Amino acid sequence: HWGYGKHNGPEHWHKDFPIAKGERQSPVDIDTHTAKYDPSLKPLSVSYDQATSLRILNNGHAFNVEFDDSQDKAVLKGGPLDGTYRLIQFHFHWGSLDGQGSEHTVDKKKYAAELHLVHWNTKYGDFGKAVQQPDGLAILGIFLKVGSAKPGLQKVVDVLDSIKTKGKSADFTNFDPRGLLPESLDYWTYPGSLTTPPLLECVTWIVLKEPISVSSEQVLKFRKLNFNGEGEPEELMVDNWRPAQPLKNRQIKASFK
Ligand SMILES: [Zn+2]
DSSP: OOOSSTTTSGGGGGGTOGGGGSSSOSOOEEOTTTOEEOTTOOOEEEEOTTOOEEEEEEOSSSEEEEEOOSSSSSEEEETTOOSOEEEEEEEEEEOSSTTOOOSSEETTBOOSEEEEEEEEEGGGSSHHHHTTSTTSEEEEEEEEEESSOOGGGHHHHHHGGGGOSTTOEEEOOSOOGGGGOOSOOOEEEEEEOOSSTTOOSOEEEEEESSOEEEOHHHHHHHTTOBSSOTTSOOOBOOOOOOOOOOOOSOOOEESOO
């Protein structure tokens, strides 16, 4: 019964998921004055030309745009990574107000939202196997600010009415996730965790510095989603973000000078 409400939010998760207080939890604050350029990092390789989106699902915590991950169709390689990571889904975290919503922060700045493109290491065969490994996942995080519209997001926005409530899904084929990327692939990277239960410490985080812009109308439509199921009391799906966690014995590395 974890969530983001008044009595089951992030500060409670440790009772059922004790790793919530672990050594490698996410998100974190990215201090641009202490993150160090690492000349051994490589350019990110994002290969999404062959991506097969399938479906969009309201899971009661966010919505996931799901991809066919049964071949190397949409892969992330390079950067900090060894090997090949397959795109399985993307989702967002967002706020009730434009001044909040992101999970990572940059010098304590919260963005209006944050996109997570989740990929699993093909060395481990299936997602469920991958999340049990310290290098099982690579998550590409992208900040959203409110300004201009993002044209490549509109098809997502326009399907949200069909998945208003928890447990609803809709066909969602032929969506191109390249339309959600900023111009630059400059990034920060560090080792961390899933930001939702089970909070497993299986992620290489790759957080892009350049945000994307979405319009106020686009974010307003996200804020019309519901955490609840159909026929239940309406609880708007807003503020579905975990706050920054202690960095502990980690370093954040920058791909750029
Ligand atoms: Zn996420």
